Design a protein around this ligand. Structure first.
Ligand SMILES: Nc1nc2c(ncn2[C@@H]2O[C@H](COP(=O)(O)OP(=O)(O)NP(=O)(O)O)[C@@H](O)[C@H]2O)c(=O)[nH]1
Ligand SMILES: [Ca+2]
Ligand SMILES: [Ca+2]
Ligand SMILES: [Ca+2]
Ligand SMILES: [Mg+2]
Ligand SMILES: [Mg+2]
Ligand SMILES: [Mg+2]
Length: 166
């Protein structure tokens, strides 16, 4: 069957792991344990296709990011995650996208922009600002909450749909 290799990237603490674990394991991780490099694999049916998701959950903390580029280079699509209550994480997205372009050696890489923690009201990134960023990259913007599950399946499945367009 088809395997989709997804890679989740973004600044430390934005909820990359919590999103991936909510998708795969159906619970919310409340604590913050910084990631080095973890992988998850699950067979799912997406738009009627039985396929295998292979998801790489990467480090956002600089200290734990050694060799992240070597993990990223295998990816077929990238979830570029920021938190809607973390303006710096949103600003960081451009540098993650530049890194993606470098590791894939391409200006045309399947990606989705994800604004996580949308259950929180300390919003400093308005939807329209992120919509505009995503538009400049030619990709969709989706908001998620790893805590409530809002948008979680949609974000990952949208990334699969973006890979299918390439
Ligand atoms: N309210 C709320 N908290 C969230 C959400 N997603 C993650 N968090 C919280 O934010 C913290 C960091 O989440 P985590 O998934 O570890 O972040 P990360 O991006 O994987 N960090 P790292 O890059 O260091 O591995 C945790 O305390 C987690 O519970 C969300 O959607 N809503
Ligand atoms: Ca594949
Ligand atoms: Ca929990
Ligand atoms: Ca390269
Ligand atoms: Mg993590
Ligand atoms: Mg503002
Ligand atoms: Mg699209």
């Amino acid at each position: 069957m088809t395997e989709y290799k997804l890679v989740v990237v973004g600044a430390g603490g934005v909820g990359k792991s919590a999103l991936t674990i909510q998708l795969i394991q159906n619970h919310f991780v409340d604590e913050y344990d910084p990631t080095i490099e973890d992988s998850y694999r699950k067979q799912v049916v997406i738009d009627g296709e039985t396929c295998l998701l292979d998801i790489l959950d990467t480090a956002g903390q600089e200290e734990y990011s050694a060799m992240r580029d070597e993990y990223m280079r295998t990816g077929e699509g990238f979830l570029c995650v920021f938190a809607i209550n973390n303006t710096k994480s949103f600003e960081d997205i451009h540098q993650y996208r530049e890194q993606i372009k470098r590791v894939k050696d391409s200006d045309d890489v399947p990606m989705v922009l994800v604004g996580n923690k949308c259950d929180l009201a300390a919003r400093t990134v308005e939807s329209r600002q992120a919509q505009d960023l995503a538009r400049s990259y030619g990709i969709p913007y989706i908001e998620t909450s790893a805590k409530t599950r809002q948008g979680v399946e949609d974000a990952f499945y949208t990334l699969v749909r973006e890979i299918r367009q390439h």
